[PDB]
Structure formats: C-alpha cells, structure tokens
Amino acid sequence: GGSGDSAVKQVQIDGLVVLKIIKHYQEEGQGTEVVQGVLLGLVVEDRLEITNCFPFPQHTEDDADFDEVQYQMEMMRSLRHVNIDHLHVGWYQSTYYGSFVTRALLDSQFSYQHAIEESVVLIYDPIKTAQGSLSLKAYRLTPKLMEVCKEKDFSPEALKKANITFEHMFEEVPIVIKNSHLINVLMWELEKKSAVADKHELLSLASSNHLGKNLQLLMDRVDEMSQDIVKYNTYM
Amino acid sequence: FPGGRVVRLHPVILASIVDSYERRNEGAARVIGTLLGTVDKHSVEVTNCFSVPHNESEDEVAVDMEFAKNMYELHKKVSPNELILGWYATGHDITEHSVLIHEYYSREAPNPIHLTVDTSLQNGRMSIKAYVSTSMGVPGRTMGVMFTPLTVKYAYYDTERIGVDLIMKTCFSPNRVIGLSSDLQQVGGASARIQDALSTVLQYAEDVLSGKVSADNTVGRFLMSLVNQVPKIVPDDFETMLNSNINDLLMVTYLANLTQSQIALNEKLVNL
Amino acid sequence: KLCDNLRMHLSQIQRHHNQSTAINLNNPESQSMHLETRLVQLDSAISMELWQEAFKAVEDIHGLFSLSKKPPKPQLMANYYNKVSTVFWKSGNALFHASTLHRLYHLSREMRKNLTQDEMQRMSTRVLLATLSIPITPERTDIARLLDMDGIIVEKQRRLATLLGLQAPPTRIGLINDMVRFNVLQYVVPEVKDLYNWLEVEFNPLKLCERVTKVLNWVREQPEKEPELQQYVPQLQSNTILRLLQQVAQIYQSIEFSRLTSLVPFVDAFQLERAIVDAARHCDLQVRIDHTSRTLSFGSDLNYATREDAPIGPHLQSMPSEQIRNQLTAMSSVLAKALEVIKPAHILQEKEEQHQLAVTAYLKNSRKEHQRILARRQTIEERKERLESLNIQREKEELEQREAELQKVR
Amino acid sequence: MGDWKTCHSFIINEKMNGKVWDLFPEADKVRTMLVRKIQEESLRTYLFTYSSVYDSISMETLSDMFELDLPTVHSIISKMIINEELMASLDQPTQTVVMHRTEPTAQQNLALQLAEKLGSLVENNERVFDH
Amino acid sequence: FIDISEEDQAAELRAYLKSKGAEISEENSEGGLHVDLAQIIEACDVCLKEDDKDVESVMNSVVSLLLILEPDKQEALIESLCEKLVKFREGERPSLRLQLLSNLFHGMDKNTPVRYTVYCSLIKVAASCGAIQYIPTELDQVRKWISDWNLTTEKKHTLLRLLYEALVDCKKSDAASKVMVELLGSYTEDNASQARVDAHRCIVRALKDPNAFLFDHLLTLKPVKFLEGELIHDLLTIFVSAKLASYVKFYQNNKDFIDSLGLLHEQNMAKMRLLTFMGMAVENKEISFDTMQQELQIGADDVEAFVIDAVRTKMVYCKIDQTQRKVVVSHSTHRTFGKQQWQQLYDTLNAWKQNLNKVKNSLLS
C-alpha cells in the first residue's frame, strides 16, 4: 500500500506538524536554505505519522552554520517529556526554491537513508512556487543508489553504478490523505471562523485576489527557470 | 488605558496545545504549557508555544519553569521573536490553582497573559480563552486575581493562514496537494456560485416586496468590486492583448514543452 | 605606507608586548590613521583601495571601540567619517549612502541624546539633510555588470554596510520611512517637510513640479543650509520626475507630451524629456516619446511585465489601475465573488452555521477522540518511545553485527 | 546610459587633466572624431536599451537630440536597420522609424532558445566524438 | 489593597480594604460589619464614599465592582460608583474598573445596563481612547442583539448623539452616526418625532460632511425610507442639489442653517462628484474631455484637475486620457436602480459567465 523498498513506509503529516513548519516557513532564512528540521515521526500502519518536529536553527543572519546538537538533544528531551521520542524518519526544508533536489543535501539525504532506510525527505513549498502543484514533496533517494554505497563517486563507481543504473528520482510518497484525529480542535477552530468572528477566513480569501493581480507568478518563476535552464543544461 | 485588552494568535498555538494534548503526556483533560510571544502597547502577539510537563491538581501545581526556561532556551535559539507571556492550560477558567500557576510565572513576572483552552463540545464556547488578571494588588498570600477578559484574534503570517485553511480543509477532508490552481478554479467557481445564489435572490428580494435594502447600494457595489477586477470594462483591444497574451504564454508553454524534450535529449542520449 | 602603517598598527598589536587600546592608545592611533585614509580619498585618490584602508580601519577600530568601551566622541568622529562618506557616497555609491546617511543621522541623534546638542537650527536642518538625499537610488545603467555578476557587487554593497552597522542597504521609500517614523521628520525645518509633503503625499500628476520647485529653490539658497544640500536638490529634482512620471503614467494613459512639456514645469525641457526616457530606457515607466510629433502615451496594460514598475517595486503611490496577471481572474473569482458571500449573505450563514454544527458533530467525536488518543496514542507515546527507538538502535546494532562478521572471513 | 554628453566630461577633460589629450596637434580633430563616435553610438545604446517600447522612432527628434545631421542619421538609422537587422519600418520621406519588436516575455523564449539550441549541438557532438 | 483569594466572605474582606481607603470609607468600613454582611450598604461604602485623594483604591473597587453584581442586584448598585469615575475626571484607573466588567465577562450583559452603565461611563471617563473600544463591542452585538428594550438603545442613541461628538472625530463621528442612524433607521426611535431632530442632524451630516457622495449613503439602505425625505426634516434638501450642480440649486435649497453654514465650497465638491458620476454613469464610463468642461462649467486643465480628485475619490477608477475618456468605473455615487439593474444585469451576466467557465475550469481540474 505505502511501502517502498523493504524498510520504508509513506509519511503521514497531519496539519499540527505543518503549522510549526510555517512558524519558521521561509523566514529566519529567506534566501537561505534553512534545513527546517528533522521529520520526527513514528512507524504505524502504512504511514510514518509525523507527530512533532523541531526547526533546527542554523546560524542564520545571512548564511547557515550548523548549530548545537545540544539543541537537538534537548528538543528530543523536550519532546520525550510530553510527546513521542526522537523517531526521526526524515528531514525537511522548504527552502527558497520550487522543486529542487540539492546535491549536498541529497548526500545528507543519502547517508540518512543508509542509516535509516525508512526515510522520506520532505521539501515543503509555500506560495514561492507560485501555486503551483505538488506543494509537499517527500522525496526519498533511490534504494538502488542506497544499494551501491558509498556514494555516487566521480570517475570510479560511476560507470559501475550506472551499469546497474540506479534511478535518479524515486518514490515521492503521498503525504496527507486522511482525517487522523489529531485534526480535532483545528477542525473546531474552523467552525468559529466559519462563525461570527469570520474576519480571519476572508482575509485568507483576500490573500488569493492579490496573489494573482500584480505578481509575475509565471514570469519571475520562468526567469528563474530560464536562468536555471541555460546554466545547468550546458554544464552537463 | 490599562494595557491588556486583546491577544492575537495563530492555530500553531492551538497546534502546540493540541499536539501536546493529543499525544497528551497522559494529560487526559488538563494539558498545560507556556505561551510565548510579544505584546504591542495594548495588544498581545502570541505566535508559538510548547507544553512544559505540568501537573495542576489539588493543591499541586507542577510548573517546571526551569524547563520553561529550557524550552525558552531552545525557542530563543530558534526564534528570537517570542518572550514568555504566561502559561496556557486547558479548560476551564478562573481557579485557585491558577493562582499557583500565577506564582510560578510571577517568579518570572512579566505581564500575566493566560490562555485557557476551553475543552468544550460546543461552538460559542471559545476554543481559546485569554485573560489578563486585574487586582493584582496582593501583598498578602499568593496572587488574588480577577481575570479581565482578553479577546483572541488571528493576525500573523498569512500563508500560514493559507496553510492552516488548507489544514482546516485537511481537518474537513483532505484535500491533498495535487491540483491546487486547478482546484482553486473550482473554489473560484464555488465562491462564484453563492454570489449568484445570493444576489439573484437579492434581485428577488426587492422583486417580491421590500428586500434588497442592505443590497441596493452595497451589493450593487459588491458586484462593482468584482467587475473592476474582471472583466475589464469590455475593451476588445484588451481581448486582443489577452489573445496575444494567450499566444504569448502558450508559446512560453510551447517552448516549455520543447525544453521538456531537449533537456531529455541530452539526458537520454548520455544514458544509452 | 598607509598599508604599511595599518600593518604596523596591526602587527604591532599582534606583537602584544604590553600594548592595549583601552588606555586610549590605539584610539588616537585610529584618529591619526583614519585621517590618513579619509583625506587623500577626498583630495585625490583611487577610491577602491584607500576606502578599504578606511573600511579596514573603521571595522577593526569599531572592535577597538568595542575593546575601549565605546568612546562616543571618536564615534562622533566616526560619525564625521560617515559624514565625510555621505558626501562621498553621494559621489560614489547610493546604497552606501543609504547606509551612511542613515548612520549619519542616528549617530548624531545619539549625540543629540548623549552630548545633548543644542543646535536646534542645525539639527532641524541636518535632519532635512538626512531625509532628502537618503532615498535617491535610480535604476542601474550597467548592462555588462549584469553579465559580469552583479551579485558580487551588491554583496560588497551589503558587506561594507554590514561594517557600518546597517547590513542590508535600505531602499528608497522605506529608508525615508525610518526617518519619518522616528520623530525627527517632525523636527525638520518645515519647508523641506512641506517639500516632502508634496513629493510624498499630495500626489497629483500635473500639480507636483509646480509646488516642489518653489521649495526646491528655497533650499537652493545655499550659504547656511549645508552645501551638501544644494547638490542634493537636482538629484532630488531628478527623483521628483521619477516620482512624478509614474503618477502621470498611472492616472493618465496618454498625456499629451506638448501639454506634458508645459504641465511639468521642470527647469529644462530637453533634459526633462531625456530624463523621461532615462527613467523609461532603464525600465521605470512606459512612454512612446520618439513619436515624430512628440507625443507620450503610456498604455493600459500593454507593457505590464516589469518596465512599468521600476523595476518590480513602484516609487509612486497607489493611483495605478486594475491590471491583470497570472491567476488574477481565478483569484478574483475566489475573493471578490465571495465578497458578497461572507458578510451580506445568509446563504453562507446558513451553510457555515451548519458547518458550525457539522464540526460540532465531529467535535462530539473529537471528545470521543480526546479519549481515544488518550486510549490509543498514550500507549503509542510509551511504545514509540521504546519499540521503534529500538529500531533506530537496530540500525546501530546491525552495523556492529556486520563489523564482527567482516572480521571473520578475510 | 546613452547620453553622449556625459562621456565627454569623463574623457576629454580628464585626458586634458592627465595631459593625454594634450599630446597631439591633431587631438582636437581626434576629439571631434570621437565626439561623433560617442554621439552616434550612444544613440544606438539609446535604441538598443529602450527597444521593446520604442515602436515608433523619430528621425526629426534624434537629429535634434543627439546633435546629428540627417545624412549621418540616414547612415545611422539604415545601418541601425540593415546591419543590426532590427525588424523596423522606415519612411525616410516621413523621417520615421517604426519597429514593433514583439516580445519581452518572449525574450525568455529567446533565452530558452539560447539554452535548447545548445541542447541540440552537444547532443550532436555526443555522437560526433563517439563516432 | 490585599488579597481576594481569601475566604469569600468578600464584603468583610473589602471592609478591611475600605479601612485603607478614605476615612469616610473607613468609618463605614467596619461600621458596616456590625450590622450585616451588607451586600448593599457596606458595598455602597465604596460606591458612596470617595476615592479619598487619588483613585489608587481601584484594586479594592474592582472587588467592589464584582461584589455588587453576583450576591446582590447587579445594575442597581453598579450604576453607582461609575459616576464617581467621571467625577474625579481621570480616565486611567476608572477605565481599569470599566475594562474588568465591560460586558459578558464578570457580570453578564443582560438586557444591557452591563454594557450601558459601563458604556455611559467610559464615554464620559475616556474622551477618545476607551470610548472607541465599546463601539465594535456594541456593533458585534448589534448584528446579534441590539438592546430590545429600545430606551437603552435610545440611551445608546443618546450616547450615539453624544459620542457623535464626545469622540473628537468627523468620520468616527459619522461612524457613531452610522451606528446611530442604522439603528435609528431600522428599529429604534420610531417615535418619528424623535426621528425629526435625528434627520435634522442627518442634514448636517450630509452637508457639513459632504461625504454622502451626495445623498448616496442616505440612499444605500434606510435613511430615506425611515427618515422621511420631504417632511419636517426636508431631508431631500441635499438630494435636490445632488443632481443639478449649480449655485442657485444649492443656495435656494440652502435653508438658513445651510445658508449660514455656509454651502459654497462643498458645492463644487458636489458639483464635481455628481457631474463626474452622472457624466460617467450616463455618458457612459468613458466621457469626453470637453464635455466635463461643459458639465463642470470650467476650462481645460481644471477638468484635468478635478479628475484627479475624482479618481482619488475612486467613484471613477481607471487610467485617464488627456483628450477624451475622462471618468470611468467603480461607481460610488448613487445609481439607485441603474446599478440595481446592473446588479440585475450582472447576476444574469455572471450566471452565464461562471457556470460556462467552471465547466471550462473543471475540464482542466
């Protein structure tokens, strides 16, 4: 149903996980690829139900330096205090691009998946992908590449690894599909805005009408695409 | 004017409540935590929180404020925007045990901004009830309080509210992320439908006896607020620009389909 | 030699044989060497090199001020080193001038608090000196430098603004609004304040150059109003036209250019119409000027991609009309069709009070789920703390298992 | 910038400041030669940079703007049309250039045909070396 | 002040608090204790006896707020001690009492003196700081439940005649009128004799404030169907001059309140925005340049001047041309049936539009 290659399930991210991602969305790192945390889930029926995740604060003034593991060791302590243990079944970012697989982060994804084969790695997409389809990409890396390990190497283990021909994209799992009853009270926050304090629901509808009027929703993306196409193709 | 009047929130607060209430730390009804945020001169901007392991009982109140410092140690490390504004707990309102949760927060003592998460089965019972404590004199026992009511509002990052509305539709029924602009078209046709369903009855309202009162020169303006946006008035050079802009962006779509192939034509030849 | 002195400043400190800055030893060594930088730069020097000799002086001695318990009077000299540079970065780089004139005023405004400057004529006239020159950042003209990687240059435009402490170089309008929100805009000698309040708020496409030029010529009265200011006037009058032309572009769709020659009472007409193009050639608005009979249309929309915006962000106020781009017509069908649906309707009010109850049915199930997750996910909270945490530890134990297995058949 | 006058401040005075203009007896002509080389060619960068929205281009204005007489301007604008190969209608009796480049968003289609034409070449060159 | 997390027993506790306050509060502090718990009399010893020299007592009066509500008659005693708040002429610590109570929390907005006594207080207690906050707190209850006993709403209308100018405002003033005249128009003060002087004020509200655009907010829902137009009012004074656009049409409509106001400069505002709109909505959303020269009886660039005023009005809103197509869509001045017929046109036009087009949408969806 949701299995990949012999150890991995799909991911199931309920919305209470998602809101803590969009507290540190594309801010505290705007043009800076914040690795926005590690996906702390749990292995349940067909699905890696993420329960809570913590945003990893890289040293973000204009760049990203790897901060304390003592943060991660205390967030796993903070989460074990009240919730599930640190069952990191992925890691997630957004983070300033539409649908890109970062090669050094793919190597951070590769050794993550060599360590824990039950892993998909999430690439969140806010309205910076111009909306835009597939706003949630839990791309895992090829288990045939996880077979020939390590890693992808340049002149040796590249003819050998591509005569096996491991795939290059593989298993972007379907993520959120179901009312998992973590839903409960944000459903109950929907009925109130629905109800007579409905000033906050139309403001999100107001965020539609101005997203389409004046933004280069196609052109500024394509100009970033035509930048990315004329460079990365010719170098290959 | 006395400061505490309004608290502005997000459902990420109600996420951090309920995710710590629906993994629960065995806290069946009472899931208690520490709200964090900022204030602005009459208003309160709470933007994220986390549940300290608490135990509010008779007459035990556990507040691991050192962990509420340690969670504040982690959160100030993540996000330098928020300050400990109080303690949140679930339902219900004013208790003599909150007077203890006053005191653990009065160990810190910034302004008392409370968040009672009324765990109710209702609609008019507000899912998050906020309070500032008045009188608030008290050199005598712990903290004698009356709670001045604070109103809860949502005003912070807006694509999180685009996000939580998708989450509230995920709360309704997922609504996975596949079609979004194509799905927006059906949502754009849905808001179109009730507009026609209302305002043609608003035609019928004045056409039966005496309706279209608040719709004579409001809904006549409400439709004018739309037709100023689409369609432009009815210019045909606009449509000639549009059919050009059809043939512009379709040619962009055409060469996107050409670069769809020629990317692969370098890719697939080198994989013979 | 100034490179030599800076090294024989630094390596002498890098000796550290009984030498400190906090006894105000290096702080006059600064004050000498800073003068050694800033004088030759202004007098006649290559700017790329000795300003780095100034910037490496200013940055290190900002740390030596941080060593020597920040002395505000050499920082008032550093304010003067900024005030020198505000002249120079109206001569060399407006984004540095975006940094330095904002650093000019507030570090003076600190000394208005720290030293309690009683210069209520000057300080009221240094703030108008701090308002007018500070926004004016036109479009770049460097076509080769875009091919020659502009992002390296703007980084250095950022980096030496990080040196001054105004890390991101601020824009046109939001940098004014720093001086506006701070109550020193109130403290302006009020002609400039009015000259601003024509250029900013009273925003009329035919009636703007008539009311600024009287007050532009007012601050052209030079001998006491800070002769920095009188060079700031025509480049403000240059930024007047860019403020004006788009306001003509977004109320009027086709001004008559023979009228626009008269309806814009600029000092020149040929340099006016050239600066009209010098906006539009560098993509600031839409004009059709080399019509042979000298007209100037704009269009609606008909160019609405980037060139009307200067370059993606306007300098005028929101007199523009309704233009259309990608997903306007879809998202106008989302909101402006729902604009009658939420408030004046009962059709949503009967549907969402139903949804107020349709959640309440699930909320009655939610309290059953408030006991079900209490029943289920509490047990998961302990088991996933233990059972699946062993499965991460299984991935750490199987790695130890393969090590001893490889240590057997070799 | 396309302004011819601004180059003359940066060259002619500064090569008199550095005595570089002060080296030839012919240098007044050499300057006057380079007067028109600045005037005629910054007229081109005036046309090259402001090209999408110029769809009617004068010849009466540009004869007055860049200070260039018509037999030069006819030698300019024809060679601006012929040699540069700009899509441009021209009525030298009316002294009017009509261009209509069409389009700047389709310049990205030109920018992608900058990319995908390279895609077809090295794909062919993949077989050229290998065979 | 000391605790109220004590035994409750709050009247004996507030008696220990009144001993800290005034000496006249102190003599009936514990003198109220010998007789009874005394939920009126000892509780009136805050309400009667003053905040002695300053209003620092208010911590004990927040106790005296809630003690005269739940054990006793609520709005009988809380109608006292709130006029003590105005009487010191301070608005900070009085507002601390009024914020703690305001409505529906700590004392139950009934049937409304709970708003109203606090609403009458903080209008007089705060000039334009706390008096604003009860207006949406009224308005969010107005579209749920206005005070059905109309006299409280009339007392609110008395305040909406007062906070019409107790706020030092012009359009919040008009918003206080738009809380007033909306509740006047629909159901309160009918009492048409009371609706005389209110519509007499609406004549002031339409010509002192020319922002009815002419009579259009007075033709939007119900100031013309309740406040009678040509009655003792003569509320249609404005509306006769709303379409005719010359001095004689104003000056002869000018009654001696308007003829001595005087109406000479809102004239050419009104002459503009009608001949703008009734140029625009008639001649038809693209009107000529020399037409408005003949409409507004002016020259060339004064038409160019007034369009800037008219596009900033956003009654007309598009890009303008210098020689024709002056005034354009967004239609803010009254088009009483012609926009209603356009509402009747567009709901027919949207029905053909969006239903055909959602099918075109759901094809690609």
UniProtKB/Swiss-Prot annotation, chain E:
The keyword Phosphoprotein applies. This is Eukaryotic translation initiation factor 3 subunit M. The modification Phosphoserine is found at residues 147, 362. Component of the eukaryotic translation initiation factor 3 (eIF-3) complex, which is required for several steps in the initiation of protein synthesis. The eIF-3 complex associates with the 40S ribosome and facilitates the recruitment of eIF-1, eIF-1A, eIF-2:GTP:methionyl-tRNAi and eIF-5 to form the 43S pre-initiation complex (43S PIC). The eIF-3 complex stimulates mRNA recruitment to the 43S PIC and scanning of the mRNA for AUG recognition. Induction: By glucose deprivation in neuroblastoma cells. GO terms for cellular component: cytosol; eukaryotic 43S preinitiation complex; eukaryotic 48S preinitiation complex; eukaryotic translation initiation factor 3 complex; eukaryotic translation initiation factor 3 complex, eIF3m. The modification N6-acetyllysine is found at residue 249. Keywords: Acetylation, Cytoplasm, Host-virus interaction, Initiation factor, Phosphoprotein, Protein biosynthesis. It is found in: Cytoplasm. Disulfide bonds: none annotated. Belongs to the eIF-3 subunit M family. Residues 175-334 form the PCI domain. Changing residue 359 to P: Reduces HSV binding and entry. Broadly expressed. One of its GO terms (biological process) is translational initiation. Residues 339-365 are annotated as: Interaction with HSV-1 and HSV-2.
